[PDB]
Structure 1
C-alpha cells in the first residue's frame, strides 16, 4: 500500500492540436491490451509473489 496516487505522463509544452491526437492514441493503446504484454516483456519480477 503506497501513499500517493500519481501518474507518469508524456509532455509537450502547449501541444498545439497534437494533444488531441496523442491522448486518443494512448486510449487506443490501452484499448487493445498490448500495454499489458509490454509489462510481460519489461515490468515483471520473479521474487515477489
Structure 2
C-alpha cells in the first residue's frame, strides 16, 4: 500500500497513525474516493 515518508527521527509517526486510522474507520476515507476515483464504463 501507499504511505507517507518521514524523517526516520521525526517522531511525528505516532500522531499521524492514530489520526489516519480514524479516517479509515467509518465514513471519512470511504467518502473521498467517491469524489475523485469514481469513473464509469466499468466491466460487464
TM-score (norm 2): 0.77
Q: Number of matched residues? A: 43
Q: Provide the aligned C-alpha RMSD in A.
A: 1.4
Gaps of 5+ in 2: none
Kindly report structure 1 stretches of 4+ aligned residues shifted beyond 4 Å. Answer: none
TM-score (norm 1): 0.71
| Superposition deviation, residue 15 in structure 1 | 4.2
- Which residue of structure 2 aligns with residue 8 of structure 1? 2
* Structure of greater relative contact order (alpha carbons < 8 Å, 6+ residues apart): 2
